[PDB]
Design a binder for this molecule. Structure first.
Ligand SMILES: [Zn+2]
Ligand SMILES: [Zn+2]
Length: 637
């Protein structure tokens, strides 16, 4: 039995438990209830043992993946935060602690691998996996190395393997499909192939494990390592000048590290469930409570939005971006906004001129975006938002176009220069894929259909298409790249499927848009000559057209949802919500791009199977194709 009138907490010894105990002393001062923080050895094993009998701690802190089994045996209580409190934490962290519809833990901290680099050896780290071979050659010639990380465990190699489309178990409608495994797909092959190619070409050694890589980085022998927040303290002691950043992209798409959510569960047998709620919600999950814990030992990243914004201020994450790939997107934004994950408004913004830079445009767009979320519920058209839009035209020194629209009813909520013509830039790309999906609905096109192109077909800013020269790309992939990664060649290839700019224009006119026109291809359509009517639209015309594609019956329910999905990813990567829904620390950035650890018992077989596969493809016993075929079988039939 658990003692009433006190809080007993179990947490791992490597966590900031002395900070946690300080939060408990503050709880004691206010309520008179003492909180005892302990770190039992193998509490991960002690908890399921004692809690079944009715004993143990009131609160247990562990990563979410273990909490699936706990909640199955009925060892955790359903928590009851209200909407106000839930909106304080990142939405994706609430999913990690959801079991059979019920919230079974409070999300606390967020952990994922990051790229850790030596700033003296490498002040500007690679954004890409493909550029590492050449960096290794430049480094080995000066007595160093580019990258060293643990190759023995599939936890460390998976971010690269999953990058191009690999996955453990598909997660749909809030449930894992134990028959849908993606370790055998084309994307998992490409990643492991590239991995084995780094070994073959002597860029990495197949025998490299955790201790070897760590010693190598902490002694300045290697430019980069891949590790988590648990490793920082040792690097701090080594006095290596290090930064922590986003993992490199493989094939133009982010690495996908497994994401662990340190979570606080409440014993089902606890008679202090209400006090546990009071402490967790109103003491621990505050900036002051998490600061106390973080000061003791680094949390990496947290689930509480407000404190993650403080973590993001840490100089270690600071990067120097030089690419002007965001230039088009800062001159043209389209976004379907809506809360609870459901869109109800359409925003169209264009900026112009040859004066303002990319950052200045991105900042102005972010400000308009923050102003929109600030005054939600008011319906739209808040005079504040109009001033922000007017400010953008002011500070950018050129015409700005703007409209805000209710998606369902077509009602104009706010407008500025809505019937003036603006170069579409990249904003035609959603309309292009609307036309594509129109062909799918008519059985004229398949999303899985594969397109060939050579290097000659490549134009500027094509980060995905340029990395699929040998295997080509799928219509579905092309649209994803065109919209979410703003791939220019992807846009052209898609244009060619429908018959060129003239057919997109015809498609738009056939649905009642007699204003919008695409005349040229990428990258020409971006020229934006003053008063040139080629490749232009109006804010109102664009908003209405977009509205008709996401409403009514122009697309099937299947095709409509697909367009919605693509548009959201473009929105969260665009500058619009960069102030309102800001990026966090490097650990959080990697976690948001990654794959939440599945909390199912079937994950055990996955680890063994992938572990063997990576060993056998690296050594030689199996080819990459064969090794993953076998690993897939070991998991599912
Ligand atoms: Zn691919
Ligand atoms: Zn017409």
């Amino acid at each position: 039995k658990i003692e009433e009138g006190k809080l007993v907490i179990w947490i791992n010894g490597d966590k900031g438990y002395n900070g946690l105990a300080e939060v408990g002393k503050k709880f004691e001062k206010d309520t008179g209830i003492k909180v005892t923080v302990e770190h039992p050895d193998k509490l991960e094993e002690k908890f399921p043992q004692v809690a079944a009998t009715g004993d143990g701690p009131d609160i247990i802190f562990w990563a979410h993946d273990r909490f699936g089994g706990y909640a199955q045996s009925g060892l955790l209580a359903e928590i009851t935060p209200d909407k106000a409190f839930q909106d304080k934490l990142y939405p994706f962290t609430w999913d990690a602690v959801r079991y059979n519809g019920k919230l079974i833990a409070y999300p606390i901290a967020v952990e994922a691998l990051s790229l850790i680099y030596n700033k003296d050896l490498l002040p500007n780290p690679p954004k890409t996996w493909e550029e590492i071979p050449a960096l290794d050659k430049e480094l080995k010639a000066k007595g160093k190395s580019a990258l060293m990380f643990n190759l023995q465990e599939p936890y460390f190699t998976w971010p690269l393997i999953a990058a191009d489309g690999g996955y453990a178990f598909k997660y749909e409608n809030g449930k894992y499909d134990i028959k849908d495994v993606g370790v055998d797909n084309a994307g998992a092959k490409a990643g492991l192939t590239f991995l084995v190619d780094l070994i073959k070409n002597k860029h990495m050694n197949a025998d490299t494990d955790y201790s070897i890589a760590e010693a190598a980085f902490n002694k300045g022998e290697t430019a980069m390592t891949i590790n988590g927040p648990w490793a920082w303290s040792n690097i701090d002691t080594s006095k290596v000048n290090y930064g922590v950043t986003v993992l490199p992209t493989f094939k133009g798409q982010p690495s996908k590290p497994f994401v662990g959510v340190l979570s606080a569960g409440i014993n089902a047998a606890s008679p202090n469930k209400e006090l546990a709620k009071e402490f967790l919600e109103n003491y621990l999950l505050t900036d002051e409570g998490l600061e106390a814990v973080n000061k003791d030992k680094p949390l990496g990243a947290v689930a509480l939005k407000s404190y993650e914004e403080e973590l993001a201020k840490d100089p270690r994450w600071f990067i120097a971006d030089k690419s002007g790939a965001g230039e088009r997107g800062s001159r043209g934004i389209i976004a379907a906004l809506g809360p609870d994950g459901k869109p109800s408004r359409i925003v169209v913004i264009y900026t112009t001129g040859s004066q303002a830079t990319m950052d200045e445009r991105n900042r102005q767009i972010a400000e308009i975006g923050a102003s929109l979320i600030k005054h939600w519920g008011s319906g739209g058209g808040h005079p504040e938002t109009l001033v922000k839009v007017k400010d953008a035209e002011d500070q950018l020194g050129a015409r700005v176009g703007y409209i805000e629209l209710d998606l369902n009813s077509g009602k104009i909520l706010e407008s500025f220069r809505p019937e003036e013509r603006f170069p579409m830039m990249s904003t035609f790309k959603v309309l292009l894929c609307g036309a594509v999906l129109s062909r799918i609905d008519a059985g004229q096109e398949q999303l899985g259909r594969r397109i060939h192109y050579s290097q000659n077909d490549l134009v500027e800013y094509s980060p995905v298409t340029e990395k699929h020269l040998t295997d080509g790309m799928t219509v579905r992939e092309l649209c994803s790249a065109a919209i979410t990664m703003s791939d220019n060649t992807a846009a052209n290839l898609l244009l060619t499927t429908i018959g060129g700019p003239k057919e997109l224009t015809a498609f738009l006119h056939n649905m009642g848009d007699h204003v919008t026109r695409l005349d040229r291809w990428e990258p020409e359509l971006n020229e934006a000559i003053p008063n040139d009517e080629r490749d232009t639209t109006m804010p109102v015309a664009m908003a209405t057209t977009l509205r008709k594609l996401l409403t009514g019956e122009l697309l099937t329910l299947a095709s409509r949802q697909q367009l919605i999905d693509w548009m959201e990813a473009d929105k969260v990567a665009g500058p619009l919500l960069r102030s309102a829904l800001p990026a966090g620390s490097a650990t959080m950035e990697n976690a948001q791009k990654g794959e939440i650890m599945p909390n199912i018992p079937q994950m055990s077989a996955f680890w063994y199977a992938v572990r063997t596969a990576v060993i056998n493809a690296a050594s030689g016993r199996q080819t990459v194709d064969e090794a993953l075929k076998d690993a897939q079988t070991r998991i599912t039939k």
